[PDB]
Amino acid sequence: NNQQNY
Amino acid sequence: NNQQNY
Amino acid sequence: NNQQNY
Amino acid sequence: NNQQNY
Amino acid sequence: NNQQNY
Amino acid sequence: NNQQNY
Amino acid sequence: NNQQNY
Amino acid sequence: NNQQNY
Amino acid sequence: NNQQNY
Amino acid sequence: NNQQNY
Amino acid sequence: NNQQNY
Amino acid sequence: NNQQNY
Amino acid sequence: NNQQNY
Amino acid sequence: NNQQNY
Amino acid sequence: NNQQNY
Amino acid sequence: NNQQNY
Amino acid sequence: NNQQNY
Amino acid sequence: NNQQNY
Secondary structure, three states, rough: EEEEEE | EEEOOO | OOEEEO | OOOEEE | OOOEEE | OOEEOO | EEEEEO | OOEEOO | EEEEOO | OOEEEE | OOEEOO | OEEEEE | OOOOOO | OOOEEE | OOEEEE | OOOEEO | OEEOOO | OOEEEE
C-alpha cells in the first residue's frame, strides 16, 4: 500500500 | 491501494 | 483502489 | 474504484 | 466505479 | 458506474 | 449508469 | 441509464 | 440533482 | 449532487 | 457530492 | 465529497 | 474528502 | 482526507 | 490525512 | 499524517 | 507522522 | 508498505 503527503 | 495528498 | 486530493 | 478531488 | 470533483 | 461534478 | 453535473 | 445537468 | 438506479 | 446504484 | 455503490 | 463501495 | 472500500 | 480499505 | 488497510 | 497496515 | 505494520 | 512526508 502507498500514502504520499506533499 | 493508493492515497496522494498534494 | 485510488484517492487523489489535489 | 477511483475518487479524484481537484 | 468512478467519482471526479473538479 | 460514473458521476462527474464540474 | 451515468450522471454528469456541469 | 443517463442523466445530464448542463 | 438526483439519479437512483434500483 | 446524488447518485445511488443499488 | 455523493456516490454510493451497493 | 463522498464515495462508498460496498 | 472520503472514500470507503468494503 | 480519508481512505479505508476493508 | 488518514489511510487504513485492513 | 497516519498509515496503518493490518 | 505515524506508520504501523501489524 | 510505503509512507512519504515531504
